[PDB]
Amino acid sequence: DDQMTFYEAVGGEETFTRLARRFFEGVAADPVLRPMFPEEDLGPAEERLRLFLMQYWGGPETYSERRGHPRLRMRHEPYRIGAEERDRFLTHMRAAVDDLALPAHLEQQLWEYLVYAAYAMVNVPEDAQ
Amino acid sequence: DDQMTFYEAVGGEETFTRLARRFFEGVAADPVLRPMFPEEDLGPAEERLRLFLMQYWGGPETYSERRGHPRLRMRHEPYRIGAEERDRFLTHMRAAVDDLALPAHLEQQLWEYLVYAAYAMVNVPEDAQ
Numbered sequence: 001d002d003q004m005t006f007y008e009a010v011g012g013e014e015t016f017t018r019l020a021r022r023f024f025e026g027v028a029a030d031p032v033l034r035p036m037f038p039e040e041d042l043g044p045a046e047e048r049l050r051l052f053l054m055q056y057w058g059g060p061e062t063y064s065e066r067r068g069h070p071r072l073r074m075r076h077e078p079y080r081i082g083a084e085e086r087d088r089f090l091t092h093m094r095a096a097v098d099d100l101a102l103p104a105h106l107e108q109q110l111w112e113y114l115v116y117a118a119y120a121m122v123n124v125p126e127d128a129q
Numbered sequence: 130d131d132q133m134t135f136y137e138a139v140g141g142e143e144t145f146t147r148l149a150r151r152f153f154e155g156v157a158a159d160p161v162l163r164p165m166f167p168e169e170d171l172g173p174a175e176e177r178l179r180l181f182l183m184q185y186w187g188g189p190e191t192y193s194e195r196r197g198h199p200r201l202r203m204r205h206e207p208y209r210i211g212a213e214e215r216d217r218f219l220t221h222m223r224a225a226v227d228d229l230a231l232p233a234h235l236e237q238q239l240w241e242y243l244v245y246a247a248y249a250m251v252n253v254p255e256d257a258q
């Protein structure tokens with residue numbers, strides 16, 4: 001038969017719209033991570049992740065066309081990101097993923113990227129690589 | 130990113146192995162359809178559907194290499210297939226699909242084929258086409 005991108009497979013945009021929602025929802029409820037972002041009305045940050053992930057899994061290039069070529073740890077250098085940090089991020093991401101209730105194969109693929117991507121992002125001298 | 134077949138998307142063989150299981154399980158429990166197949170030990174029929182559907186969604190060509198080019202209503206001409214029949218088949222297929230609990234997009238694609246394919250298969254002069 002025909003072939004498809006992960007984006008279309010996990011059911012397209014609404015999926016990612018949902019993922020980021022249940023994510024920041026928990027981020028809101030987290031003390032250390034509420035601080036992490038300055039001020040309030042930080043619902044546009046939600047849009048970014050959303051647009052990025054859409055783009056990563058083979059969706060709309062939208063993210064680039066507003067935020068350019070994704071320089072990830074550049075945009076993460078501003079921040080004091082350590083274990084405690086990442087761990088809490090991931091706990092909100094774990095929660096966010098179970099809510100999508102994907103087939104194990106896809107879920108395994110999505111979650112694994114985000115597990116690396118958050119372990120990668122850590123910038124303080126804590127890790128082994 | 131990379132692309133994938135529906136087969137791999139819905140998580141490959143175990144998915145289809147499961148689909149046919151919960152299907153024939155209900156077929157077993159159905160009077161009209163238990164008759165439909167002669168004698169007993171009709172668990173190999175389960176294997177066929179399984180192998181076929183695997184093949185259809187972009188899986189292993191296995192089905193052909195044992196049962197040849199799939200001539201569907203040929204292999205269905207032997208049988209007196211009407212509405213009541215198909216309807217009961219579909220009810221076991223509906224049940225079988227909900228158990229996989231797929232994302233709506235994929236589920237919608239799988240189920241829709243099988244909805245047509247069973248409406249197509251009907252051979253008595255009942256339908257509109």
Ligand code: HEM
Pocket residue numbers: 036037044045048049052053067075076079081085086089114117118119121122
């Ligand atoms: C290690 C845990 C992480 C923490 C503590 C964290 C936190 C942050 C912070 C504080 C910002 C800046 C706010 C903003 O730019 O609006 C940010 C931005 C961003 N993060 Fe993370 N993040 C983490 C991991 C990740 C991961 C794994 C991804 C990839 C899926 C990601 C994707 C992004 C994106 C796309 C932006 C916005 C960049 C832009 O377009 O300006 N972050 N994150």
Ligand code: HEM
Pocket residue numbers: 165166173174177178181182196204205208210214215218243246247248250251
């Ligand atoms: C309309 C309702 C249907 C009824 C009542 C029905 C019933 C049957 C019967 C009585 C047989 C013969 C048993 C056998 O060959 O072992 C059979 C065979 C088969 N059916 Fe159906 N069927 C229906 C729809 C479908 C559909 C929609 C598909 C496609 C997904 C399908 C796929 C097959 C396959 C692959 C075989 C075995 C052919 C072979 O390799 O010998 N059937 N079915």
